[PDB]
Amino acid sequence: AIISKKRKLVADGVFYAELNEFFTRELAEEGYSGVEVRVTPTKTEIIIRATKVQDVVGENGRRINELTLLIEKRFKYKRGTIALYAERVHDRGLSAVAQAESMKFKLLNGLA
């Protein structure tokens, strides 16, 4: 902690990007679209927009918990200071990333 403000910002951005990439990689089955990061004091809110919200969740805190743990491991945080949430997307068709993902899935399956 304690760096040049600009530098800090850049770092944060990089972290966000990394997170996004991870989500893209990992939550393919779940149909992930995008992340929303809110860095308040103490807690940090990581909101996730995916299609299969239930899938993302697991069975009342499992997959999400694991993800959180992984994040903590990556970025030297403690338990409590990261808070994941898996939310629905308001209109999937308006989103582009989601659509792309769907298309990819279809291709994988083997469709015209």
Binding site: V10, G13, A17, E18
Partner: protein, 53 residues
């Protein structure tokens, strides 16, 4: 397990890898990015960097 498996790679092209590819080619080390330029370009918008002028 072997003793000598390390030249001193403190500094230079060899030490400074990127975050994504782990390359030593076109490495943006400005503002502590540490990103091969192509990679940065691919993600720049997500990392807050936008084209204006």
């Amino acid at each position: 397990e072997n003793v000598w498996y390390s030249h001193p790679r403190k500094f230079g092209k060899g030490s400074r890898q990127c975050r994504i590819s782990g390359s030593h080619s076109g490495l943006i080390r400005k503002y502590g990015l540490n990103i091969d330029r192509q990679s940065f370009r691919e993600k720049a918008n997500d990392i807050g960097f936008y084209k204006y002028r």
